[PDB]
Design a protein around this ligand. Structure first.
Ligand SMILES: CN(CCS)C(=O)c1ccc(C=O)cc1
Ligand SMILES: CN(CCS)C(=O)c1ccc(C=O)cc1
Ligand SMILES: [Cl-]
Ligand SMILES: [Cl-]
Ligand SMILES: [Mg+2]
Ligand SMILES: [Mg+2]
Ligand SMILES: [Mg+2]
Ligand SMILES: [Mg+2]
Ligand SMILES: [Mg+2]
Lengths: 8, 236, 236, 8
């Protein structure tokens, strides 16, 4: 599970 | 450049077509041409610029991570010597990625940021500046690494200061900025506690402001809040 | 149209390149695209528009005259019947020529003339309108021929009235207008005496005003005066 | 000798 950055 | 002969409105139109066709390199080139016309960008146009370059650099970053993992394995004990090719190809992708980051940073410096006076535009561009320095930091291994990291930090910090003074806690730009600055803290600046604090505080302040929003704004804000929650669940 | 995506300045630049390469069809298409941007034209840009279309229609007119002469010979007594081909091909060239004239007249009507308030621009565009109706008149043989001729006459007359009130008698636009209106009288309106009077009077009034001019303006004006003299020598 | 109109 890769951390989220601001992406759609 | 090569887009100097095309009308600004045609570049925008073609950027939207390129997005529909998932031609993000073309989309970015069209939006670079539009920026270079010298007029400020509307909200929609800023989003097109950001989507285009985030997709281009996102593909490069994913490829760089694949190649970097292969290279790291090649340098473990017991691994066969396979020559310079893995390093060379990782370096080729890395140099391309750095070039795209430098291109975006150049557009921001000449002259998007200096012309951006409204909070929504200025915060957006400063967030972008932090993001592209962060992507440079992901691949930096040399003597300028500390300065690259501080450039990302400084851009994010100025964006945060403006966003706290001028935007509501549910504003999507404010939320996306905080999400990305929290990732910066966690995985670039070696500050997981700062990352967690920023995510939790951002989430809680947005939650307290949801009551002010329309149904559509509530959906926009809660979507980004869920990303903050995803990271908090991963990190705690 | 097809030039809607190209910048106005790029269309102008390419029109100048097309002129250097003697690519007058391209030059005209670029200048049509520039006009359709909706901004008024500078003096240099009006000249580029005029040069481009005059060269295109000049080639068509010369070809039409060759074909019309062949067709006329085919209809003399003792000439062999060769079928419909000469008429068909003359008609094809004629229709193309009429299309170019209609294109220029359409640009003048939508919306060059109505926006032109200075004497130099308004006279220039009205002269053009007279010229392209005159070229339509050269090939007209039907029921609208009188109306085509009167449209040329009316445009030239309005241009003459403005030019006499607002321009000096040596102004190159005034002189070129008078030259062309005199040709209209001679060979379209069956009025050779009016043509001769207009040429001689225009020449004499310009001669009396040369003393006011710089060396460069004197060269510009005397060049056109020589065309008036050439016609007077031919016609008298 | 063709009559002159306003041409370069
Ligand atoms: C849904 N979404 C993407 C996940 S943060 C956004 O609303 C957004 C996009 C760009 C920026 C800058 C801020 C927010
Ligand atoms: C030399 N020359 C062409 C022979 S009239 C001109 O100066 C000129 C050109 C276009 C118009 C219209 C008027 C004058
Ligand atoms: Cl390589
Ligand atoms: Cl034919
Ligand atoms: Mg433009
Ligand atoms: Mg506000
Ligand atoms: Mg702790
Ligand atoms: Mg005057
Ligand atoms: Mg007589």
């Amino acid at each position: 599970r890769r951390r989220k950055s601001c992406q759609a | 450049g090569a887009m100097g002969s095309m009308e600004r409105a045609s570049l925008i139109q073609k950027a939207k077509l390129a997005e529909q066709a998932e031609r993000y390199e073309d989309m970015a080139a069209f939006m670079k041409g539009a920026v270079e016309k010298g007029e400020e960008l509307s909200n929609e146009e800023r989003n097109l610029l950001s989507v285009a370059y985030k997709n281009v650099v996102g593909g490069q970053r994913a490829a760089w991570r694949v190649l970097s993992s292969i290279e790291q394995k090649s340098n473990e004990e017991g691994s066969e010597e396979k020559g310079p090719e893995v390093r060379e190809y990782r370096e080729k992708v890395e140099t391309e990625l750095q070039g795209v980051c430098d291109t975006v940073l150049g557009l921001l410096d000449s002259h998007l940021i200096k012309e951006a006076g409204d909070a929504e535009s200025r915060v957006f561009y400063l967030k972008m500046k932090g993001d592209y320095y962060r992507y440079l930091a992901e691949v930096a291994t040399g003597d300028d690494k500390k300065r690259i990291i501080d450039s990302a930090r400084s851009a994010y910090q100025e964006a945060m200061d403006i966003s706290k003074k001028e935007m509501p806690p549910t504003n999507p730009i404010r939320l996306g900025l905080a999400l990305n600055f929290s990732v910066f803290h966690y995985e670039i600046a070696n500050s997981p506690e700062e990352a967690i604090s920023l995510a939790k505080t951002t989430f809680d302040e947005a939650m307290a402001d949801l009551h002010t929003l329309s149904e559509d704004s509530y959906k926009d804000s809660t979507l980004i809040m869920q990303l903050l929650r995803d990271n908090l669940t991963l990190w705690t």
